[PDB]
Amino acid sequence: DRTQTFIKDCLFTKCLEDPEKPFNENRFQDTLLLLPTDESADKQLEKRDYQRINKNSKIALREYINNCKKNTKKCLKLAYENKITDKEDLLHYIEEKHPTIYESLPQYVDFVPMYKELWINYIKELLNITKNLKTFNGSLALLKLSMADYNGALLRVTKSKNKTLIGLQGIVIWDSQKFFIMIVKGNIIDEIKCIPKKGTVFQFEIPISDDDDSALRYSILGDRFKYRSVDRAGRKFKSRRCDDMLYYIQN
Amino acid sequence: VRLKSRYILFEIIFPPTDTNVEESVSKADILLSHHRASPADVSIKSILQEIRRSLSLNLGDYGSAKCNSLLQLKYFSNKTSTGIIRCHREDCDLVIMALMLMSKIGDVDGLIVNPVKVSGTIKKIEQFAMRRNSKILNIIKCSQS
Amino acid sequence: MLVDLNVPWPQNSYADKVTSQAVNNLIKTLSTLHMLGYTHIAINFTVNHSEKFPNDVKLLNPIDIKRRFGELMDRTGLKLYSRITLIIDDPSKGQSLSKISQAFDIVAALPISEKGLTLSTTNLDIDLLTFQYGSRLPTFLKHKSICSCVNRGVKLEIVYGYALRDVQARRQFVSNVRSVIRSSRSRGIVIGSGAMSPLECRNILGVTSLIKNLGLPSDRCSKAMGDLASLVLLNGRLRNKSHKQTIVTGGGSGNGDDVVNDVQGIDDVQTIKVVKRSMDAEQLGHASKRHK
Amino acid sequence: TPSDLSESGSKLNVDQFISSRQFEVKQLQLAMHNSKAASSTRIFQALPRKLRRRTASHNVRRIPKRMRNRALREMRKGLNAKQLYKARMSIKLLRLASKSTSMKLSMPPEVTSSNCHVRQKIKTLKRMIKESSTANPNIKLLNNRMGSYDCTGVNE
Amino acid sequence: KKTFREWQYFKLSITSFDQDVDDAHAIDQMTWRQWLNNALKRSYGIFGEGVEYSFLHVDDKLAYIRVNHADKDTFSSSISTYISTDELVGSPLTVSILQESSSLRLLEVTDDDRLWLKKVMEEEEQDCKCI
Amino acid sequence: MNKDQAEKYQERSLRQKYNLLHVLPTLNSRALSGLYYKNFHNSVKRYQIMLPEQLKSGKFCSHCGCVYVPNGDSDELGGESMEGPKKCIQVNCLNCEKSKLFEW
RNA sequence: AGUCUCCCACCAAUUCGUAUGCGGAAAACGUAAUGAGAUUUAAAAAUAAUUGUUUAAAUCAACUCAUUAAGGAGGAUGCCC
RNA sequence: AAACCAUAGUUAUGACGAUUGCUCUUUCCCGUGCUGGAUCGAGUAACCCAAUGGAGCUUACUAUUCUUGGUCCAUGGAUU
Ligand SMILES: [Mg+2]
Ligand SMILES: [Zn+2]
């Protein structure tokens, strides 16, 4: 195949100005294609039931949040007007004098002992917290915690972009996708706390009191807590930029 | 974002340094006595080495290092003594000053380097060279009378 | 805050044994760096990729930060990190980075070829991309590759400490640095000093003057040495210490105990942090109201 | 033959296509140019940007979703005035889905005009339209075949 | 209605890390000038040597050099590059730029050399603005 | 992740979810009941393991998601009324006012 | 900038003779009212183009899909009156 | 053998000087205030660059690395 190539080279030296380019940039196709370019019933029932339960639970959670947000304001204003500082006084007062408004307010005194211990036992048995601490594995424990469930957990905001969100402790009731739901207590504060996750740092401490008084210092990062696997593994991860964490080093 | 190049056109002119011989005063006579010819010992690597030596001797170390990154002689022939050197747009003035500060060749003495046209494209350089060559013939034809 | 990430170690292959004079010169240069002023220093350990890597873990890191550097840091007042540069030329089969990346903190690369450069930019999980400023560049660096790599992670490193070595090396150093700055769009640039003795060290103003003479502005130089250095340290610290940026074993209560800052507290043979109980459920939530 | 068969289709080979026909090309070039055939320069000039056009795609087209949905409606499925327009649009959509290639490519598989029985529907709806009491000699009678009448308003 | 930059001050200091050699060997004012000329000639050609500069308040490894605003970069880049070798001491010398000032307001000690320099440049600043 | 330690983690997570689905709020708060019910079911769907029909029949509510419970730990009752047939057997609750009836 | 789409000759018609929410020559084009949806879905994921992150998954906001043909006349309701 | 044609046209859009305007901070004044005036300064950015023309869509931009308008059943403080 020398002669016909030379002939088409002489053919290109008439039209084109540099005849040897189409062969080097591979612009002369040797081939050109000529072709037109070319037990089910219960399953349905349970799927409908689950969809309905989800759609109802969402509205129920929204209405519960709204009711709590209104009741905190109302009770706090009534307490400020009522010449009352202590919580044990305001609680009993609104008990005797405001029957209905008391059925909606929550009781953190019972929210602590059930949730905290049932979460601590589960995490202790999951991370294999033993009387001895010579049987640990850091990377595997980190993988487990990334896979672990954090419903009913105590978390503290230690660092945040906002200077006011830091230092808040609370037990969560539901894990959303953008906001974080907890409950905090004070002398008269019973605020349901909705805190943003974009730009905040959390931490959770596990008590260990075999013989000495020790605790594990763990922490999570909300910014990258949204793209984690849930309850299992085997998900393709992507390096994002690892650049929007300047607030961590700044302060 | 985009590599900006700038070519410089330079010419070698030999002044008639001879006080024992009287000269004719006109346009084409001095044009011919200044554009006589270049010597045989003339090349591209011999002019590039000379200009590199001159640049390193006049500017210095960093002054030669910054210009010697894209310092090349693209087209030059000894028949007419016109050459086109490629350089950057940042160090173009330094290359022009080095061409001005060119003292002499290692074997040939008494010559001047004249920068004529500088631009960022070779097509306009060739067009200006053709225009200058056409203009040169006019005074020659007029003086041959 | 000033960070120097390219302090070379007097050793290239594991067959070498470092004498006391070299570690004493390193002690002297660390004291010199602390005298004028510095905040973070990460020493480098260069090794080649082709030869076999020892099948050990407790023998892969010949730095011993705790024994000698831990003995001098209480008098010095700064922290040290271990870094390794993988000089890769051809895609050989010897590749066990899953151990070296976990044993070390920061992993960099020094490619010589184009295929090695492409594979290290795409597939190799590294932190910094260093070029041989002593030798010539492999080929013409493109813009899109460097920009996509900066957006994806790994940035380029400029070593101004090499220009103090020889006389003919400065020309190639400048010719490489200008091309790197032009092709990287002046975004992912981290500057380091590759000096083996305290005789070739400079002040921050000298570095600023040299870089601004090279072509990069001074404010961008300060920005890249202040925040881009801390971020590239945090990346290499969190990708190893923590998981893939989901759970961190370090808890910052105030402003001094950070995963990159707190180095003596966080255990390294494991990843636990034994701290006394400071968070119970009976304390008031509001930190302004919570008083001890 | 310069072309070949394949499992996919019928392909053409350029090599033999021009190698077999060389003397014909030489005769054509000598018939076009007589004095410049022996020379070797650039004869043909570049295309002016004004005459230059752009390249389209190799697909046919993409149908809108509304027309496709209405075609699906009609295919799967005294009269009031709106039921006249409904039947007219129904026959129009059937004719479209019959002729249109984009609509056919947007139609669902296992659906053809024979199974949908387009012809009987067309006949029934045309019977409805002819029952719709058309007044043709009230519309007007024109002069030619292509629509061209006079729009002249006297004192208005 | 603006200000013309006459020159810029540069706080230099020879910093060699050997006290055993520093206390033994002495450094005078001609050494500084010789080192500057050698640095200029080794890093640059005549371009670097033609830099205008004087000496003010020479001390033990402390000196104040005024350099024009036009070649401040050329000065500060050659200062941070060169390292003395076999000039006057067997131990190499290098200079570290302490700070820079463009308004004569700088703080070292309670001496009056700065004061008489300021006197001269006061009677010259008013003179240059008036003329 | 090792398979032997992954199986154990699976059973532990299932146990923890079912335990949190019990004590105070999943009984009282219908919102949290539905939420933790949805979470447990999304967790058992990801493992693709069949669930026991014996409990799946009368497991929870379909309107809110509370345990169907009539009247060591005194707690709240889930179902307030459970009539006879009266035409056909049905069950009602307190958390909401809907009732679910099954035919013999 | 981008491997996205389309116009840049006509065709009383084998030539998308398409009166189909509105504008538009076309657009793998802009926007408006209502209802619903989340690998348990019409379809996005943890067995044509583009984007480092790449819709949502308390409420809002954002994406996708499913309906509403142009003009004139009569009755009822609501507002200034 | 040409159809050769751009109020940029084939990867050219260079070198500095001067003036006005904008952001915050430094101070003064009348009458709190004013698209108020006057100095002492800094900044005028980032994304990126045409190669025949127009429209639609998507994707990169604006942290002491110029700006502007509005919203938020986001939190932080104060009054009712
Ligand atoms: Mg382009
Ligand atoms: Zn219910």
Short mmCIF file of all heavy atoms in Angstrom, two decimals, chain G residues 2 4-5 7 29 50-51 53 58-59, chain H residues 51 53 55-56 58-60 73-74:
data_model
loop_
_atom_site.label_atom_id
_atom_site.label_comp_id
_atom_site.label_asym_id
_atom_site.label_seq_id
_atom_site.Cartn_x
_atom_site.Cartn_y
_atom_site.Cartn_z
P G G 2 -13.36 24.61 25.33
OP1 G G 2 -12.20 23.84 24.80
OP2 G G 2 -14.11 25.53 24.43
"O5'" G G 2 -14.40 23.57 25.95
"C5'" G G 2 -14.01 22.67 26.97
"C4'" G G 2 -15.21 22.07 27.66
"O4'" G G 2 -15.93 23.11 28.36
"C3'" G G 2 -16.25 21.44 26.74
"O3'" G G 2 -15.91 20.13 26.34
"C2'" G G 2 -17.52 21.53 27.58
"O2'" G G 2 -17.54 20.50 28.56
"C1'" G G 2 -17.32 22.87 28.29
N9 G G 2 -17.95 23.98 27.55
C8 G G 2 -17.30 24.92 26.79
N7 G G 2 -18.12 25.79 26.25
C5 G G 2 -19.37 25.39 26.68
C6 G G 2 -20.65 25.95 26.42
O6 G G 2 -20.94 26.94 25.73
N1 G G 2 -21.66 25.23 27.06
C2 G G 2 -21.47 24.12 27.84
N2 G G 2 -22.57 23.57 28.37
N3 G G 2 -20.28 23.59 28.09
C4 G G 2 -19.29 24.28 27.49
P C G 4 -20.25 17.16 21.96
OP1 C G 4 -20.58 16.54 20.65
OP2 C G 4 -19.86 18.59 22.01
"O5'" C G 4 -21.50 16.96 22.93
"C5'" C G 4 -21.70 17.80 24.06
"C4'" C G 4 -23.16 17.94 24.40
"O4'" C G 4 -23.33 18.95 25.43
"C3'" C G 4 -24.06 18.41 23.27
"O3'" C G 4 -24.44 17.37 22.38
"C2'" C G 4 -25.23 19.04 24.01
"O2'" C G 4 -26.11 18.03 24.50
"C1'" C G 4 -24.52 19.68 25.21
N1 C G 4 -24.15 21.09 24.94
C2 C G 4 -25.15 22.07 24.81
O2 C G 4 -26.34 21.75 24.91
N3 C G 4 -24.78 23.35 24.57
C4 C G 4 -23.49 23.67 24.47
N4 C G 4 -23.18 24.95 24.23
C5 C G 4 -22.46 22.70 24.60
C6 C G 4 -22.83 21.44 24.84
P U G 5 -24.63 17.67 20.82
OP1 U G 5 -24.74 16.37 20.11
OP2 U G 5 -23.60 18.65 20.40
"O5'" U G 5 -26.05 18.39 20.73
"C5'" U G 5 -27.25 17.67 21.01
"C4'" U G 5 -28.46 18.57 20.92
"O4'" U G 5 -28.37 19.63 21.91
"C3'" U G 5 -28.65 19.31 19.60
"O3'" U G 5 -29.25 18.51 18.59
"C2'" U G 5 -29.49 20.50 20.01
"O2'" U G 5 -30.86 20.13 20.15
"C1'" U G 5 -28.93 20.82 21.39
N1 U G 5 -27.87 21.85 21.35
C2 U G 5 -28.22 23.16 21.05
O2 U G 5 -29.36 23.51 20.80
N3 U G 5 -27.18 24.05 21.03
C4 U G 5 -25.85 23.78 21.30
O4 U G 5 -25.03 24.70 21.24
C5 U G 5 -25.57 22.41 21.60
C6 U G 5 -26.56 21.52 21.63
P C G 7 -31.15 22.35 12.63
OP1 C G 7 -32.03 21.66 11.65
OP2 C G 7 -29.70 22.05 12.65
"O5'" C G 7 -31.32 23.92 12.41
"C5'" C G 7 -32.61 24.52 12.34
"C4'" C G 7 -32.52 26.01 12.11
"O4'" C G 7 -31.85 26.64 13.24
"C3'" C G 7 -31.70 26.44 10.91
"O3'" C G 7 -32.44 26.38 9.70
"C2'" C G 7 -31.27 27.86 11.28
"O2'" C G 7 -32.31 28.79 11.02
"C1'" C G 7 -31.09 27.74 12.79
N1 C G 7 -29.68 27.53 13.19
C2 C G 7 -28.78 28.61 13.14
O2 C G 7 -29.18 29.71 12.74
N3 C G 7 -27.49 28.41 13.52
C4 C G 7 -27.09 27.21 13.94
N4 C G 7 -25.82 27.07 14.30
C5 C G 7 -27.98 26.11 14.01
C6 C G 7 -29.25 26.31 13.64
P C G 29 -31.66 21.77 25.60
OP1 C G 29 -32.36 22.01 24.31
OP2 C G 29 -30.17 21.80 25.64
"O5'" C G 29 -32.21 22.82 26.67
"C5'" C G 29 -33.60 23.06 26.82
"C4'" C G 29 -33.92 24.53 26.70
"O4'" C G 29 -34.57 24.78 25.43
"C3'" C G 29 -34.90 25.09 27.73
"O3'" C G 29 -34.28 25.40 28.96
"C2'" C G 29 -35.47 26.31 27.02
"O2'" C G 29 -34.58 27.41 27.11
"C1'" C G 29 -35.50 25.83 25.56
N1 C G 29 -36.84 25.34 25.16
C2 C G 29 -37.80 26.27 24.74
O2 C G 29 -37.50 27.48 24.72
N3 C G 29 -39.03 25.84 24.37
C4 C G 29 -39.31 24.54 24.40
N4 C G 29 -40.54 24.16 24.02
C5 C G 29 -38.36 23.57 24.82
C6 C G 29 -37.15 24.01 25.19
P U G 50 -19.11 15.63 29.97
OP1 U G 50 -17.76 15.38 29.41
OP2 U G 50 -19.88 14.50 30.55
"O5'" U G 50 -18.98 16.76 31.08
"C5'" U G 50 -18.79 18.12 30.71
"C4'" U G 50 -19.48 19.04 31.69
"O4'" U G 50 -20.91 18.93 31.53
"C3'" U G 50 -19.24 18.73 33.15
"O3'" U G 50 -18.03 19.30 33.63
"C2'" U G 50 -20.48 19.30 33.84
"O2'" U G 50 -20.35 20.69 34.04
"C1'" U G 50 -21.55 19.06 32.78
N1 U G 50 -22.36 17.85 33.01
C2 U G 50 -23.47 17.95 33.84
O2 U G 50 -23.78 18.99 34.39
N3 U G 50 -24.18 16.79 34.00
C4 U G 50 -23.92 15.56 33.43
O4 U G 50 -24.66 14.61 33.67
C5 U G 50 -22.77 15.54 32.58
C6 U G 50 -22.05 16.65 32.41
P U G 51 -16.87 18.37 34.24
OP1 U G 51 -15.61 18.67 33.51
OP2 U G 51 -17.37 16.98 34.30
"O5'" U G 51 -16.72 18.92 35.73
"C5'" U G 51 -16.97 20.28 36.02
"C4'" U G 51 -17.95 20.42 37.16
"O4'" U G 51 -19.25 19.93 36.75
"C3'" U G 51 -17.63 19.62 38.41
"O3'" U G 51 -16.67 20.25 39.23
"C2'" U G 51 -18.99 19.45 39.06
"O2'" U G 51 -19.35 20.62 39.78
"C1'" U G 51 -19.91 19.33 37.84
N1 U G 51 -20.22 17.92 37.50
C2 U G 51 -21.36 17.37 38.04
O2 U G 51 -22.11 18.00 38.78
N3 U G 51 -21.60 16.07 37.69
C4 U G 51 -20.83 15.27 36.87
O4 U G 51 -21.18 14.11 36.65
C5 U G 51 -19.67 15.91 36.35
C6 U G 51 -19.41 17.18 36.67
P U G 53 -17.36 15.82 42.83
OP1 U G 53 -17.51 14.34 42.76
OP2 U G 53 -17.88 16.66 41.72
"O5'" U G 53 -18.01 16.32 44.19
"C5'" U G 53 -17.63 15.74 45.43
"C4'" U G 53 -18.07 16.57 46.60
"O4'" U G 53 -17.60 17.93 46.45
"C3'" U G 53 -19.57 16.72 46.80
"O3'" U G 53 -20.15 15.61 47.47
"C2'" U G 53 -19.68 18.01 47.61
"O2'" U G 53 -19.42 17.77 48.98
"C1'" U G 53 -18.51 18.83 47.04
N1 U G 53 -18.95 19.81 46.02
C2 U G 53 -19.51 21.00 46.47
O2 U G 53 -19.66 21.25 47.66
N3 U G 53 -19.89 21.87 45.49
C4 U G 53 -19.77 21.69 44.13
O4 U G 53 -20.17 22.57 43.36
C5 U G 53 -19.18 20.44 43.74
C6 U G 53 -18.80 19.57 44.68
P A G 58 -35.54 14.47 57.22
OP1 A G 58 -34.41 15.32 56.79
OP2 A G 58 -35.31 13.37 58.19
"O5'" A G 58 -36.67 15.42 57.82
"C5'" A G 58 -36.36 16.35 58.85
"C4'" A G 58 -37.59 16.81 59.59
"O4'" A G 58 -37.19 17.56 60.77
"C3'" A G 58 -38.50 17.78 58.84
"O3'" A G 58 -39.39 17.13 57.94
"C2'" A G 58 -39.21 18.50 59.97
"O2'" A G 58 -40.22 17.68 60.54
"C1'" A G 58 -38.07 18.64 60.98
N9 A G 58 -37.32 19.89 60.76
C8 A G 58 -36.02 20.02 60.35
N7 A G 58 -35.62 21.26 60.23
C5 A G 58 -36.74 22.00 60.58
C6 A G 58 -36.97 23.38 60.65
N6 A G 58 -36.05 24.30 60.37
N1 A G 58 -38.20 23.80 61.04
C2 A G 58 -39.12 22.88 61.33
N3 A G 58 -39.03 21.55 61.29
C4 A G 58 -37.80 21.17 60.91
P U G 59 -39.66 17.77 56.49
OP1 U G 59 -40.76 17.01 55.85
OP2 U G 59 -38.36 17.90 55.79
"O5'" U G 59 -40.20 19.24 56.79
"C5'" U G 59 -41.51 19.45 57.31
"C4'" U G 59 -41.78 20.91 57.57
"O4'" U G 59 -40.75 21.45 58.44
"C3'" U G 59 -41.76 21.83 56.36
"O3'" U G 59 -42.96 21.79 55.60
"C2'" U G 59 -41.47 23.18 56.98
"O2'" U G 59 -42.64 23.72 57.59
"C1'" U G 59 -40.49 22.80 58.09
N1 U G 59 -39.08 22.90 57.64
C2 U G 59 -38.55 24.16 57.41
O2 U G 59 -39.18 25.20 57.56
N3 U G 59 -37.25 24.17 56.98
C4 U G 59 -36.43 23.08 56.77
O4 U G 59 -35.28 23.25 56.39
C5 U G 59 -37.05 21.82 57.04
C6 U G 59 -38.32 21.77 57.45
P A H 51 -13.49 30.63 19.85
OP1 A H 51 -14.92 30.49 20.23
OP2 A H 51 -12.54 29.53 20.14
"O5'" A H 51 -13.42 30.93 18.29
"C5'" A H 51 -12.83 30.00 17.39
"C4'" A H 51 -12.46 30.65 16.08
"O4'" A H 51 -11.66 31.84 16.34
"C3'" A H 51 -11.62 29.78 15.13
"O3'" A H 51 -11.96 30.10 13.78
"C2'" A H 51 -10.20 30.24 15.43
"O2'" A H 51 -9.28 30.02 14.38
"C1'" A H 51 -10.41 31.73 15.68
N9 A H 51 -9.39 32.35 16.53
C8 A H 51 -8.50 31.72 17.37
N7 A H 51 -7.70 32.54 18.00
C5 A H 51 -8.09 33.80 17.56
C6 A H 51 -7.64 35.09 17.86
N6 A H 51 -6.64 35.35 18.71
N1 A H 51 -8.24 36.13 17.24
C2 A H 51 -9.24 35.87 16.39
N3 A H 51 -9.76 34.70 16.02
C4 A H 51 -9.13 33.69 16.65
P G H 53 -17.20 33.90 15.61
OP1 G H 53 -16.69 34.97 16.51
OP2 G H 53 -17.23 32.50 16.08
"O5'" G H 53 -18.67 34.31 15.16
"C5'" G H 53 -18.94 35.58 14.59
"C4'" G H 53 -20.38 35.71 14.18
"O4'" G H 53 -20.67 34.83 13.07
"C3'" G H 53 -21.41 35.32 15.23
"O3'" G H 53 -21.64 36.35 16.18
"C2'" G H 53 -22.63 34.98 14.40
"O2'" G H 53 -23.30 36.15 13.97
"C1'" G H 53 -21.98 34.32 13.17
N9 G H 53 -21.91 32.85 13.30
C8 G H 53 -20.77 32.09 13.27
N7 G H 53 -21.00 30.81 13.40
C5 G H 53 -22.38 30.73 13.52
C6 G H 53 -23.22 29.59 13.69
O6 G H 53 -22.89 28.40 13.77
N1 G H 53 -24.56 29.95 13.77
C2 G H 53 -25.04 31.23 13.69
N2 G H 53 -26.37 31.37 13.79
N3 G H 53 -24.27 32.30 13.53
C4 G H 53 -22.96 31.97 13.46
P A H 55 -26.63 35.85 21.17
OP1 A H 55 -26.89 37.07 21.98
OP2 A H 55 -25.35 35.12 21.35
"O5'" A H 55 -27.82 34.83 21.42
"C5'" A H 55 -29.17 35.23 21.25
"C4'" A H 55 -30.12 34.06 21.37
"O4'" A H 55 -29.88 33.13 20.29
"C3'" A H 55 -29.96 33.22 22.63
"O3'" A H 55 -30.62 33.78 23.75
"C2'" A H 55 -30.53 31.87 22.20
"O2'" A H 55 -31.95 31.89 22.23
"C1'" A H 55 -30.08 31.81 20.74
N9 A H 55 -28.81 31.06 20.57
C8 A H 55 -27.59 31.57 20.20
N7 A H 55 -26.65 30.66 20.13
C5 A H 55 -27.29 29.48 20.47
C6 A H 55 -26.84 28.15 20.58
N6 A H 55 -25.58 27.78 20.35
N1 A H 55 -27.74 27.21 20.94
C2 A H 55 -29.00 27.59 21.17
N3 A H 55 -29.54 28.80 21.11
C4 A H 55 -28.63 29.71 20.74
P G H 56 -30.07 33.50 25.23
OP1 G H 56 -30.79 34.40 26.17
OP2 G H 56 -28.58 33.53 25.19
"O5'" G H 56 -30.52 32.01 25.54
"C5'" G H 56 -31.90 31.65 25.54
"C4'" G H 56 -32.08 30.16 25.73
"O4'" G H 56 -31.58 29.45 24.57
"C3'" G H 56 -31.32 29.55 26.90
"O3'" G H 56 -31.98 29.73 28.14
"C2'" G H 56 -31.20 28.09 26.48
"O2'" G H 56 -32.40 27.39 26.75
"C1'" G H 56 -31.03 28.21 24.97
N9 G H 56 -29.62 28.17 24.55
C8 G H 56 -28.85 29.21 24.10
N7 G H 56 -27.63 28.86 23.80
C5 G H 56 -27.58 27.50 24.08
C6 G H 56 -26.52 26.57 23.95
O6 G H 56 -25.36 26.76 23.55
N1 G H 56 -26.91 25.30 24.34
C2 G H 56 -28.15 24.95 24.79
N2 G H 56 -28.34 23.66 25.13
N3 G H 56 -29.15 25.81 24.92
C4 G H 56 -28.80 27.06 24.54
P U H 58 -29.43 26.49 33.70
OP1 U H 58 -30.37 26.49 34.84
OP2 U H 58 -28.86 27.78 33.22
"O5'" U H 58 -28.21 25.53 34.06
"C5'" U H 58 -28.42 24.13 34.23
"C4'" U H 58 -27.18 23.34 33.91
"O4'" U H 58 -26.79 23.59 32.53
"C3'" U H 58 -25.94 23.71 34.71
"O3'" U H 58 -25.91 23.09 35.98
"C2'" U H 58 -24.81 23.27 33.79
"O2'" U H 58 -24.61 21.87 33.86
"C1'" U H 58 -25.39 23.60 32.41
N1 U H 58 -24.96 24.93 31.93
C2 U H 58 -23.71 25.04 31.36
O2 U H 58 -22.94 24.10 31.25
N3 U H 58 -23.37 26.30 30.93
C4 U H 58 -24.15 27.44 30.99
O4 U H 58 -23.71 28.50 30.56
C5 U H 58 -25.44 27.24 31.59
C6 U H 58 -25.79 26.03 32.02
P U H 59 -25.34 23.88 37.26
OP1 U H 59 -25.70 23.11 38.48
OP2 U H 59 -25.76 25.30 37.14
"O5'" U H 59 -23.76 23.81 37.08
"C5'" U H 59 -23.10 22.57 36.90
"C4'" U H 59 -21.73 22.76 36.29
"O4'" U H 59 -21.86 23.44 35.01
"C3'" U H 59 -20.77 23.63 37.07
"O3'" U H 59 -20.14 22.93 38.13
"C2'" U H 59 -19.81 24.12 36.00
"O2'" U H 59 -18.86 23.12 35.68
"C1'" U H 59 -20.75 24.29 34.81
N1 U H 59 -21.25 25.68 34.68
C2 U H 59 -20.41 26.61 34.09
O2 U H 59 -19.30 26.33 33.68
N3 U H 59 -20.92 27.88 34.00
C4 U H 59 -22.16 28.31 34.43
O4 U H 59 -22.48 29.49 34.28
C5 U H 59 -22.97 27.29 35.03
C6 U H 59 -22.50 26.05 35.13
P A H 60 -19.62 23.73 39.42
OP1 A H 60 -19.19 22.75 40.45
OP2 A H 60 -20.63 24.76 39.77
"O5'" A H 60 -18.32 24.49 38.90
"C5'" A H 60 -17.71 25.50 39.68
"C4'" A H 60 -16.56 26.15 38.95
"O4'" A H 60 -16.97 26.50 37.60
"C3'" A H 60 -16.06 27.46 39.54
"O3'" A H 60 -15.15 27.25 40.61
"C2'" A H 60 -15.42 28.16 38.34
"O2'" A H 60 -14.11 27.68 38.12
"C1'" A H 60 -16.32 27.68 37.19
N9 A H 60 -17.33 28.67 36.78
C8 A H 60 -18.65 28.40 36.49
N7 A H 60 -19.34 29.45 36.11
C5 A H 60 -18.42 30.48 36.14
C6 A H 60 -18.54 31.86 35.85
N6 A H 60 -19.68 32.43 35.46
N1 A H 60 -17.44 32.63 35.98
C2 A H 60 -16.30 32.04 36.37
N3 A H 60 -16.06 30.77 36.67
C4 A H 60 -17.17 30.02 36.54
P C H 73 -38.04 31.93 59.93
OP1 C H 73 -39.35 32.54 59.58
OP2 C H 73 -37.07 32.71 60.75
"O5'" C H 73 -38.33 30.55 60.67
"C5'" C H 73 -38.89 30.52 61.98
"C4'" C H 73 -39.19 29.10 62.40
"O4'" C H 73 -40.62 28.85 62.31
"C3'" C H 73 -38.57 28.01 61.53
"O3'" C H 73 -37.21 27.77 61.83
"C2'" C H 73 -39.49 26.82 61.80
"O2'" C H 73 -39.18 26.22 63.04
"C1'" C H 73 -40.85 27.51 61.92
N1 C H 73 -41.59 27.51 60.64
C2 C H 73 -42.27 26.35 60.25
O2 C H 73 -42.23 25.36 60.99
N3 C H 73 -42.95 26.34 59.09
C4 C H 73 -42.98 27.43 58.31
N4 C H 73 -43.66 27.37 57.17
C5 C H 73 -42.30 28.62 58.68
C6 C H 73 -41.62 28.62 59.84
P A H 74 -36.13 27.67 60.65
OP1 A H 74 -36.00 29.02 60.03
OP2 A H 74 -36.49 26.51 59.79
"O5'" A H 74 -34.76 27.34 61.39
"C5'" A H 74 -34.31 28.14 62.47
"C4'" A H 74 -32.83 27.98 62.71
"O4'" A H 74 -32.10 28.46 61.56
"C3'" A H 74 -32.25 28.76 63.88
"O3'" A H 74 -32.45 28.10 65.12
"C2'" A H 74 -30.79 28.91 63.49
"O2'" A H 74 -30.07 27.72 63.79
"C1'" A H 74 -30.88 29.05 61.97
N9 A H 74 -30.86 30.46 61.53
C8 A H 74 -31.93 31.22 61.14
N7 A H 74 -31.60 32.44 60.77
C5 A H 74 -30.22 32.48 60.93
C6 A H 74 -29.27 33.49 60.71
N6 A H 74 -29.59 34.71 60.27
N1 A H 74 -27.97 33.21 60.97
C2 A H 74 -27.67 31.99 61.41
N3 A H 74 -28.47 30.95 61.65
C4 A H 74 -29.75 31.26 61.39
#
